[PDB]
Amino acid sequence: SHMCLVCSDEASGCHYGVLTCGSCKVFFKRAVEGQHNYLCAGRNDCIIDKIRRKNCPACRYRKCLQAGMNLEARK
Amino acid sequence: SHMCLVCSDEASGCHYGVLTCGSCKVFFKRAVEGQHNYLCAGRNDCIIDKIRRKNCPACRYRKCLQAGMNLEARK
DNA sequence: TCGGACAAAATGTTCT
DNA sequence: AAGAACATTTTGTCCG
Ligand SMILES: [Zn+2]
Ligand SMILES: [Zn+2]
Ligand SMILES: [Zn+2]
Ligand SMILES: [Zn+2]
């Protein structure tokens, strides 16, 4: 009820359509708006938790999108 | 040879006993001088190349050790 | 070579 | 729920 759905950290509230923490909220906006081409170094199935969420932006971003995060969600 | 044995970027010379780039040189020094309680988000065999070497410090440090890097290489 | 200082990228928190 | 500003962590380059 107060776990980030992306990294399981303590969730602040609902951001861009999904219960997430502050760090995943800002990560998501940066991933969408910025140009990076994230690439997984594993098997496209990395564990994303409070510690490990720094280790694979590709899998973190993929999880944000799959949980349904969207920038224009207030519309 | 002219390629870093850890990440396959252009090597800048032989550092801590091994042909490596400057980024792997300082990454290793920082890991050995400091803490290196890193956690892999995959299965401890992450691919370490020029872009993905940022992803997993745990597997990067393992690759430095496996290549034989050591601080007292000189003396 | 090795390492300090500087610089940049990447991530996270506070405040409105 | 959203985003600007700041702060920290992590990484990489220069060394007129
Ligand atoms: Zn999160
Ligand atoms: Zn991954
Ligand atoms: Zn390297
Ligand atoms: Zn790994």
Cα A57 to middle of ligand 3, angstroms: 20
Residues 6 or more apart in contact with residue B29 via CB below 8 angstroms = B16, B71
A64 contact partners, CB below 8 Å, separation of at least 6: A6, A18, A20, A24, A27, A28, A31
The resolution of the experimental structure, rounded to one decimal in Å, is: 1.7
Give the DSSP per-residue string, A33-66. HS------SSSS----STTGGGT-HHHHHHHHHH
Cα(A60) to ligand 4 centroid in Å equals 15
Euclidean distance between the first and final Cα of chain A, in Å?
A: 24
- Which amino acid is residue B24, in one-letter code? C
How much of chain B is in helix, strand and coil states, percent to nearest 5?
35, 10, 55
For A27: left if phi > 0, alpha if psi spans -120 to 50, otherwise beta; the answer is alpha
Nearest to B56 by CA among B46, B70, B66: B46
Contact residues for A74 (Cβ-Cβ < 8 A; gap 6+):
none
Cβ pair B55:A40 closer than 8 A: yes
- Whose tokens are 């401890």? That residue is B44
SS3 assignment, position B14: strand
Is B16 within 8 Å of B28 (Cβ atoms)? yes
Span between the terminal Cα atoms of chain B, in Å: 24
In angstroms, the CA A6 to CA A15 distance is 11
For residue A34, give the nucleotide whose C1' atom is nearest its CA: C10
**Domain range holding B41?**
1-75
Burial class (CB in 10 A: 0-12, 13-18, 19+), B37: exposed
Nearest to A25 by CA among A17, A47, A39: A17
CA distance B7 to B53: 6
Ligand closest to the CA atom of residue B62: 4
CATH number, residue B18: 3.30.50.10
Among B55, B56, B62, the residue to mutate for chain A (most A Cβ within 10 A): B55
Structure tokens at A71: 């920038």
DSSP code of residue B43: S
- Domains identified in chain B, total number: 1
- Distance from CA(A9) to C1'(D16), angstroms, rounded: 49
Way the structure was solved: X-ray
* D5 C1' to B75 CA distance, Å: 48
